[PDB]
Amino acid sequence: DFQQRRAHLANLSDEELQTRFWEMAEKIVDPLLDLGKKNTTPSIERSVLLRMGFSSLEAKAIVDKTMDRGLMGKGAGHIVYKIAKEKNISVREAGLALSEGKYWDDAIQ
Amino acid sequence: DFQQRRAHLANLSDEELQTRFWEMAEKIVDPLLDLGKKNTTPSIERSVLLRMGFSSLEAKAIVDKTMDRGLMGKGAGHIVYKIAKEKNISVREAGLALSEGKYWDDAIQ
Amino acid sequence: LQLRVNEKLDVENILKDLDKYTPKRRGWTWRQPAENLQMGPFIYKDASTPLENSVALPSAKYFGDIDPQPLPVITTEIASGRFEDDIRRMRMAAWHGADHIMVIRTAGQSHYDGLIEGTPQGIGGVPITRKQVRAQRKALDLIEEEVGRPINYHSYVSGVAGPDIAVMFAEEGVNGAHQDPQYNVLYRNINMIRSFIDACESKTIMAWADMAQIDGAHNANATAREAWKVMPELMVQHALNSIFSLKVGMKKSNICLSTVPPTAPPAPSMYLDLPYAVALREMFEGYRMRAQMNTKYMEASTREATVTHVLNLLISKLTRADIQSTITPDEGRNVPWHIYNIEACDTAKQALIGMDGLMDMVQLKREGVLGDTVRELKERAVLFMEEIIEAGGYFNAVEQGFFVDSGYYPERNGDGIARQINGGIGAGTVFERDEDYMAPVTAHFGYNNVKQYDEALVSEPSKLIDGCTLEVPEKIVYIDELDENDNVNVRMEETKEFRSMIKPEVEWQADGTVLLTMFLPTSKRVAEFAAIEFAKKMNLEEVEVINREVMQEAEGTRIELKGRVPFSIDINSLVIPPILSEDEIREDIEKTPLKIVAATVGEDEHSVGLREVIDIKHGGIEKYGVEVHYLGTSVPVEKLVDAAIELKADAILASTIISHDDIHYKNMKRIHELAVEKGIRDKIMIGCGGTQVTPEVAVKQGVDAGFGRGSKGIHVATFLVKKRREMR
Amino acid sequence: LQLRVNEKLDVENILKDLDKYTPKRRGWTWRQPAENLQMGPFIYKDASTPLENSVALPSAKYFGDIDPQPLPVITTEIASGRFEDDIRRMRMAAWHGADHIMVIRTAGQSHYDGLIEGTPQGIGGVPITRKQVRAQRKALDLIEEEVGRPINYHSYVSGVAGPDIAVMFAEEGVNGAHQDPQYNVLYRNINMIRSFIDACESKTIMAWADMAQIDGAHNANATAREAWKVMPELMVQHALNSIFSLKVGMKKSNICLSTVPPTAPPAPSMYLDLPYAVALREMFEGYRMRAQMNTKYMEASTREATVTHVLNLLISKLTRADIQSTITPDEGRNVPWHIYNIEACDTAKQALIGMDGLMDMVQLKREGVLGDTVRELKERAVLFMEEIIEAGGYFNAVEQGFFVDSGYYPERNGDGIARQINGGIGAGTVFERDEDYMAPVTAHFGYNNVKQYDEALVSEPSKLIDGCTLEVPEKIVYIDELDENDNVNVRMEETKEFRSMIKPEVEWQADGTVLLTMFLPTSKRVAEFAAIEFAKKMNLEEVEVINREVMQEAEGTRIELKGRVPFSIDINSLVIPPILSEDEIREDIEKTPLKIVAATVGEDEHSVGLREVIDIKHGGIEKYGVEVHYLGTSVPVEKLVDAAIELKADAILASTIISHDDIHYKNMKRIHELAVEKGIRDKIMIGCGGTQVTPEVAVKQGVDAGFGRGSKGIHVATFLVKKRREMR
Ligand code: B12
Ligand code: B12
Ligand SMILES: Cc1ncc(COP(=O)(O)O)c(/C=N/CC[C@H](N)C(=O)O)c1O
Ligand SMILES: Cc1ncc(COP(=O)(O)O)c(/C=N\CC[C@H](N)C(=O)O)c1O
Ligand SMILES: C[C@H]1O[C@@H](n2cnc3c(N)ncnc32)[C@@H](O)[C@@H]1O
Ligand SMILES: C[C@H]1O[C@@H](n2cnc3c(N)ncnc32)[C@H](O)[C@@H]1O
């Protein structure tokens, strides 16, 4: 088998062969990168919350509640942000509230 | 230093240098081999005796007497051999006796 | 602020005020090259800057105690479950040259769907938390200022909580980490759609933090049935992670392939592994190489491991290693111990320094079977890639079992691991982003609608909140401990006890383990159980046989065992007393020359003992420049003393081997008296030697020094120059 | 008479009837190449013929326990002082590939002016005599038939009694010998005329016996101040013995240069020694290369020793080694122990095999800096010879101290050894041969006037006596013992008991020694002393520290110690009890598939433990081919049971980490109940695991097996295939 299969590659110069290797490597990965552009996961949202000022405990609670309300598509961080602004409160307060059940009806609205 | 010493080798090829090294090695050992051709020692002579069928205790004793009577120059083996013939007895007879003081008169004669 | 080389790490003090600890610096550091570096009498071609403080190789004592450091970053792996003990080992490793400390995580940390907090006890690794990372980074700041050279602190971003860890790591100045979305799928069965989406973010963060990334391809060695068959797959895993990471935006110079030579002796391992190594350095020019050493084909022998490691290092020197990680020689025998991390570091240093400049003298035969085999491996990889696309991509490829298969690609034995696009851990947790999705932080990978709020802030989404934690470290929420009983404070409180009894350890304070090595003249199974009965009778407990090697089936067996010491030693209960060097002795004799007369006395014909301490062959005094007048044997004391006067000597040295009716002491008396009788006695030295001599009893017979069984020329040379020195 | 692989070598029987023993063989044997030899899955390029019986390397088990053997003859050095103990070690060494056994002589044998007889105890070596030679050669004759490849026996011809010894070695089968007339003068101060006149005879006797000759050049390494300055002297000593031996009549192919690479790390040792090695082999084309390992720059770390030995071995591989000698890695620590010879044999073998074929892929960059240095070294050496001639020859050179000078020739520092042409041991024992000088024997070098007795016998002088011992072995005078106290039988009666009780030994029957390695957290001095006390309290006698390594000044120190076990053990008083492989478990499941449902059960969210016995990463049952449906955590017990019926699982594996209120054992009972209740209990295997699970207690709740701390996939997969079998 290896002989039969390699036949097309048998005339490629080392750089034809190396760039081909890499070209295909690239096609194998582009779609995975696309999924990463257009989608999210609870770890990504929790991590976004870490960076916005929240603990692990707090991120879990906000994101768990974000999933319950089918709001992941907006970004848990966005929720915390938009709520902060339409209650004239701090980021740090919106998120703590949210992590405790408050303001979810307002978010859905 | 070294750079001065080596000026006369500088133009030699690798082959001529090897040759020179060995021809000089052989000049150096030639006189040593020569000494070998023309001289004997207590160790060489005990070793001839060992090879003629004598123990090491015997061979020391025969050689220690040969040095004593000044006949190393003939060969301690020689001495044993001659004595055996001239008295018409076995090489070990000759030698056993020689190692305890007998026939040394005859040898000098 | 502090670290004194003669005082231990105040680990307690280290654990204080972690809430206030900020890392000193960010990112990965490489070693600094040092062109044509002179150290002692030598010049080195492949060296980096020497350390300010360090422990040199044992045989460095012959050369001014030089500690040349090679150019590759050197890794050692420290993680026993108790990071607070481990911190002490880190200090040993840095002194022996390690500048990359890798902390393997407590088993299954990949599965924690978020950060954990505090300092629980780990299992086969350390549980990675903010407090623990701070402890160690803080520690390695102190250790690095001391040794004089920055240490890269390193752990793992693997798992379902990759993005969470990448953030924590990035805030706390973790210098390097492993991340490979394929690891998660293949070996942890993390859902593959979630794994690849998470990696985009994890890598984006690591790029921000300028960390070195290591990939997961060493795993394919471990899970291959025959590792010399798995090279096409490795190339593919290396390629896919590599280019993924590049397109995410990570620098080529931070992307490092984790590459372990597949085989070990008795395989012909250089020949099998060398073409793989070249093909890999060629296809992956641009990227970094993290060589790491064999673990697959390894057993309970530290000797055997070490030898294989030097060949591993050779493959690195003959090709290229940006990072050279190490594996401890006991790894396949026991959980690693302090002394074996150190062995590993010294071995890497020793071997690489040994090979300094080698590539100015040796080169690859690039055309020849090398070239053909390299070309073949590259083709096998290319074909692997073509078939992945033909199956419709990466996901389809994994579902059909292309990976972890035992065949030599393109042969497929059909025993791969097939993960399911819809299955695995966190299957069902991917969420589509809406048109109005937004995240207001630095270093987010994906679609981010920032324009809906501020056109201007698109390029710095954090501004919406006046810094996320990558800009404003004060917004980090530090948690101390969540478990009141299972933590570092309770554990350290547990051994305030030892802080001045002492006992052994291998990894944790006072853990009392030691290593027992013996040979036993019998069959191996009998040997094994006989060995335990000796260790018991030496009062060891928890005794385990951990290496058996056969010498010969009948003749006997090597056995190593580890055991526990069930008591301690009061340091202060120890009687501990309060040294001229060969070179010191030699310089002394050049200034003022020393002259000797020597004979084997009486009617004694035994010449050797005296000759042994004179001939240079076995370190006799000829070595140290001494001038010796030897008068043979059966030489009466009279003539020996007359000869010292005659020759105008500094010492008489006589031998007595024959000792019937104490004739050997009776003849020392004489020399001393005879030398007195003639008057030279105070102006000259007299040593005397013999099989049945006692260095005590011979000063008793008048003479100055005595010498028995085992005397060397160092001893008699020592004597001479120290006595001479009492006078002049 | 026999030899059986499971019966110990019978020394006493070996010692019987030595006056009747002849050599089976004479002369030297090289190893036979086995071109392109296949062993297990590999083909070898530089292999030699395999052994019929041997111990393979540890890691050979992963490859069908193959034991490939390399090109060069391999040496080990066995010489404890008691040859009767040393035979047993020889057997071990032979199974481990050693096919040249070298017996270092008792300290100062060179000074014995003639053969010694019997079997007195040596010190630092074996007293070489006809009896001891016949015993070891007889035993080796047996040990070589066992392993299935000839073994070369080797000792030394040095000293005042050269020709006596060469005769005895000739007569008694010795296969190889050291002989250099320079060794005698330079290092033992034996008269130079006596020395060279004896060498002529010696070497002739050695030629006759088709023996391999090893020279004495290595000694110049030991006596160098800086071995990297000593090379031009080395080339010179190698030449003179080599040409001298050539003209005496020795075959080039038997003339072996003793070449040790001069440096060791932290010197740039490859870079320093590689050009010497190349220059030496270029210049001495046609001669044999006896590579030997470094002892000069060595210490008490076995590790350090072993690594430098691999670089030594690399040097050989990059050039040539016809014989490769080995050094035991304990040689700077103790007199070599059994087990450390065996290390050396394994290291030599492992490294060389690991480099099999290496020179098809790598070559010397002979043009460039290497050739420049090769050339320079050669020129330095030619100038050395020039000056010798210019001085008026060898004897003047030596007198003027040309040799053993610390300078880098032609730099001379003035510190050389100077021997007196008139002087030394045996000055004035050279006698002029007369015109009627004669010796009626074969293998005599000098002028022999046999013409005066018979011109026909000139070429066969022993016809004069009807054969010398060289032709008529029958004439050899065998002496058993001269001393009736110090002989082999008194020593043997001392340990007759130990021949059904046992103790450890390092070199001599029941010597009781063992090694203890430990780390102690304190400075090296205290650590040393503490270490002595722990060894005391462990019931060890005669305790010496033999190795100290600083981990770090404060943090701690590695100590190693030897000591004696004062007790013995009866092999009967020992209680010894009377397993499925990975492959076996894999095979069982390939053929009969095996589907499992699993879950962490109840409310429990701790998931890691269960995945850890399942994911393929740390050996979980996935790796064996088990189809695993995972239901997650907090899965109620009934749910897991319904899942098993619906999916037709062969087993339920469940985890239970929280154990508050015996909730672990309880949900065990509720699963068995539910199974019973639903009428599938005897069709299904139930395994339950968790941190506080005690298997015995688990089985008592009705489940088939329980799994606690430290469980692995292999444990779990083993129970599954075992129970299922038992079930049907
Ligand atoms: C080989 C040997 C001989 C050789 C001589 C060796 C030679 N040419 O040098 C021959 C020649 C074979 C021989 C002959 C005899 N020997 Co003897 N010999 C031995 C033997 C086996 C070896 C000793 C030896 O050389 N050791 C090697 C060296 C390294 O050890 P060392 O000599 O003790 O030297 C070390 C230390 O003592 C110290 N040292 C020694 N001298 C000095 C001097 C100075 C200044 C210093 C600083 C240090 C120092 O440093 C050295 C190295 O660390 C011993 C037995 C034994 N196992 O010890 C007997 C032995 C000593 N000799 C013995 C006897 C009886 C004899 C004979 C009488 C036997 C007979 N034929 O009847 C004859 C007499 C010879 C004579 N005229 O003196 C007995 C002595 C008994 C007694 N106490 O009287 C011994 C002990 C054997 C025995 N145990 O029965 N033997
Ligand atoms: C990490 C951890 C957690 C994590 C778990 C993350 C995860 N994904 O698993 C989080 C952080 C989630 C956690 C939460 C809690 N935990 Co917790 N946790 C730990 C910890 C430190 C380690 C557990 C672990 O993963 N060990 C490593 C694995 C590999 O070991 P293992 O589980 O023993 O598995 C091995 C064996 O048991 C065996 N095995 C196990 N199961 C099975 C099954 C089968 C079929 C087989 C064949 C073999 C097998 O194989 C494995 C090794 O080979 C332990 C303490 C400890 N040292 O054990 C507690 C601990 C178990 N949890 C504890 C508690 C109290 C909690 C919380 C209640 C705390 C709280 N928040 O109030 C919660 C409860 C959450 C819940 N809903 O259940 C207690 C349990 C107390 C008790 N007496 O029951 C512990 C003991 C800590 C303590 N001493 O207080 N904690
Ligand atoms: C040429 C020669 N003759 C005799 C002796 C020793 O033998 P006496 O003590 O009887 O002099 C030595 C020393 N050899 C060290 C061996 C090394 N391990 C080797 O690999 O050769 C020697 O070099
Ligand atoms: C990419 C990756 N992630 C995580 C883990 C740890 O695994 P959990 O957290 O899943 O238990 C491993 C495993 N071993 C360490 C690497 C090796 N000691 C090395 O030198 O490379 C891994 O390879
Ligand atoms: C059992 C594991 O669960 C985590 N954990 C999270 N919250 C708590 C809590 N309130 N009490 C105890 N442990 C907790 C860790 O503290 C611990 O290591
Ligand atoms: C003491 C040493 O002297 C040598 N020797 C030579 N002859 C005798 C003898 N008759 N008795 C004892 N030893 C003797 C030995 O071979 C011994 O080892």
Side-chain angles (χ1 to χ4, degrees), chain D residues 119-144 146-284 286-322:
Chain D
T119 51
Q121 169 153 284
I123 323 290
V126 180
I128 299 299
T129 73
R130 195 181 289 277
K131 173 172 192 166
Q132 158 281 312
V133 164
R134 276 185 191 196
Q136 291 189 324
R137 187 56 266 190
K138 164 161 172 182
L140 286 153
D141 279 5
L142 281 163
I143 300 162
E144 66 172 57
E146 176 158 75
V147 299
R149 177 226 260 156
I151 301 165
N152 291 287
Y153 188 51
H154 183 134
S155 200
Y156 295 76
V157 171
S158 320
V160 274
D164 316 40
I165 292 153
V167 166
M168 189 266 276
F169 282 6
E171 300 160 317
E172 296 289 342
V174 177
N175 316 98
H178 278 57
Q179 208 289 317
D180 201 319
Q182 303 163 103
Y183 165 79
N184 282 23
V185 188
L186 286 190
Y187 312 104
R188 280 305 203 197
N189 185 38
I190 301 178
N191 178 253
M192 67 185 83
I193 317 162
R194 170 61 177 281
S195 172
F196 278 78
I197 297 160
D198 290 28
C200 295
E201 188 75 1
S202 284
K203 291 188 185 298
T204 304
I205 285 159
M206 285 168 66
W208 176 94
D210 183 55
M211 304 183 72
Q213 181 185 83
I214 277 189
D215 63 25
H218 43 276
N219 295 280
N221 284 70
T223 64
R225 281 295 129 266
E226 290 149 277
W228 73 95
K229 291 173 187 162
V230 85
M231 291 126 74
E233 203 204 301
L234 283 179
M235 287 168 82
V236 166
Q237 289 184 40
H238 284 310
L240 295 189
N241 189 61
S242 295
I243 202 78
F244 181 98
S245 296
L246 182 54
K247 307 255 282 193
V248 181
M250 278 182 175
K251 297 180 180 161
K252 268 202 195 198
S253 71
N254 273 351
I255 299 154
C256 310
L257 275 68
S258 192
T259 184
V260 175
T263 75
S269 61
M270 289 308 287
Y271 200 90
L272 287 169
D273 309 337
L274 186 47
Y276 170 61
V278 174
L280 202 73
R281 289 165 186 81
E282 294 194 340
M283 197 73 91
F284 292 78
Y287 292 102
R288 300 287 184 170
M289 290 307 137
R290 174 266 181 144
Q292 172 56 287
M293 291 176 202
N294 148 260
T295 41
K296 191 183 190 76
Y297 302 112
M298 179 157 289
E299 246 268 352
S301 178
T302 52
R303 192 211 45 86
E304 185 186 50
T306 279
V307 163
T308 295
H309 294 166
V310 176
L311 301 170
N312 288 160
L313 287 159
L314 185 48
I315 281 284
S316 286
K317 190 74 203 188
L318 296 175
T319 66
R320 175 170 84 267
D322 292 275

Side-chain angles (χ1 to χ4, degrees), chain B residues 5-6 8-9 12 14 20 22 25 37-41 43 45-46 51 53 56 73-74 78, chain D residues 113 117 164 194 198 201 283 375 379 383 385-386 431 433-434 436-438 442-443 447 453 468-469:
Chain B
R5 298 276 326 246
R6 72 162 286 278
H8 76 279
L9 310 179
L12 292 178
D14 287 331
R20 172 158 255 254
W22 289 103
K37 279 74 174 290
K38 302 180 177 164
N39 295 283
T40 183
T41 71
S43 52
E45 297 292 300
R46 295 185 305 258
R51 275 178 281 187
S56 80
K74 306 287 165 186
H78 199 176
Chain D
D113 198 10
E117 307 284 342
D164 316 40
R194 170 61 177 281
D198 290 28
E201 188 75 1
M283 197 73 91
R375 173 62 188 223
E379 292 179 346
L383 291 153
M385 303 278 246
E386 282 185 349
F431 295 88
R433 292 168 178 255
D434 279 346
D436 48 335
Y437 179 91
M438 185 266 151
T442 313
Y447 171 85
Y453 288 113
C468 64
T469 51

Side-chain angles (χ1 to χ4, degrees), chain A residues 6 39 41 43 45 56, chain C residues 117 198 247 379 386 433 437:
Chain A
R6 75 179 285 290
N39 298 274
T41 72
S43 46
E45 304 304 316
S56 51
Chain C
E117 310 280 351
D198 284 3
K247 305 262 240 153
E379 293 186 3
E386 292 176 336
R433 285 165 200 247
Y437 174 91

Side-chain angles (χ1 to χ4, degrees), chain C residues 299 363 419 558 617, chain D residues 61 219 299 343 363 622:
Chain C
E299 246 276 324
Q363 59 166 41
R419 304 310 200 183
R558 183 174 173 175
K617 169 56 188 202
Chain D
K61 57 169 205 194
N219 295 280
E299 246 268 352
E343 292 226 339
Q363 62 185 176
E622 233 176 7

Side-chain angles (χ1 to χ4, degrees), chain C residues 311-495 498-510:
Chain C
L311 304 164
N312 291 160
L313 296 164
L314 180 56
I315 279 282
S316 295
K317 192 63 189 196
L318 286 175
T319 66
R320 170 165 74 259
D322 291 285
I323 299 169
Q324 178 66 232
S325 296
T326 65
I327 284 268
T328 64
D330 57 342
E331 207 261 342
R333 187 176 78 178
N334 70 244
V335 177
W337 295 353
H338 300 309
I339 56 174
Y340 292 116
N341 289 85
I342 279 36
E343 280 209 2
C345 303
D346 296 340
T347 293
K349 185 165 64 175
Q350 187 180 347
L352 284 173
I353 293 296
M355 302 172 180
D356 184 80
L358 191 73
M359 296 322 280
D360 293 327
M361 294 193 175
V362 167
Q363 59 166 41
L364 295 180
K365 299 201 72 182
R366 188 48 180 71
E367 174 162 16
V369 70
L370 186 61
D372 302 331
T373 293
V374 155
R375 176 56 190 244
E376 156 176 320
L377 294 165
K378 286 180 199 156
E379 293 186 3
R380 292 179 180 280
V382 169
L383 291 170
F384 210 135
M385 301 274 225
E386 292 176 336
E387 195 184 2
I388 294 171
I389 292 165
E390 186 176 28
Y394 183 75
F395 288 170
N396 290 351
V398 178
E399 285 208 313
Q400 321 208 325
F402 280 28
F403 300 92
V404 205
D405 186 87
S406 92
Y408 187 10
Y409 190 89
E411 123 181 318
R412 178 159 303 113
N413 287 343
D415 45 359
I417 302 301
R419 304 310 200 183
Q420 302 140 31
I421 190 152
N422 57 312
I425 302 310
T429 56
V430 176
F431 292 104
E432 185 188 21
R433 285 165 200 247
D434 288 340
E435 157 276 332
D436 62 317
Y437 174 91
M438 180 274 163
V441 287
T442 335
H444 189 69
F445 177 71
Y447 178 84
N448 207 6
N449 192 2
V450 176
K451 279 224 161 194
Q452 73 188 313
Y453 291 95
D454 203 324
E455 314 99 88
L457 286 58
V458 170
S459 78
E460 291 290 343
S462 73
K463 268 144 175 182
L464 267 24
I465 52 171
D466 307 333
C468 70
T469 62
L470 302 191
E471 280 97 350
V472 182
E474 297 80 37
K475 307 181 161 195
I476 298 168
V477 180
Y478 183 77
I479 285 52
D480 192 30
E481 305 282 349
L482 293 159
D483 191 313
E484 306 150 317
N485 319 117
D486 176 16
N487 61 75
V488 66
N489 303 310
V490 180
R491 275 189 260 109
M492 289 257 263
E493 204 299 310
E494 223 272 303
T495 41
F498 287 72
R499 235 136 67 233
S500 85
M501 303 290 258
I502 201 189
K503 58 191 306 212
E505 50 180 73
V506 291
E507 42 190 8
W508 300 346
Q509 211 145 226

Side-chain angles (χ1 to χ4, degrees), chain A residues 60-81 83-103:
Chain A
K60 177 174 190 280
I62 285 168
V63 175
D64 271 2
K65 289 168 186 328
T66 295
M67 284 179 292
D68 259 69
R69 308 267 179 177
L71 258 10
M72 288 283 280
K74 303 308 191 6
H78 196 184
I79 298 301
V80 159
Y81 180 77
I83 288 311
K85 274 175 62 178
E86 274 188 34
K87 300 283 147 180
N88 243 131
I89 51 165
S90 76
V91 164
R92 180 63 195 171
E93 266 296 0
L96 209 65
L98 292 171
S99 75
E100 303 177 309
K102 297 184 215 71
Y103 298 148

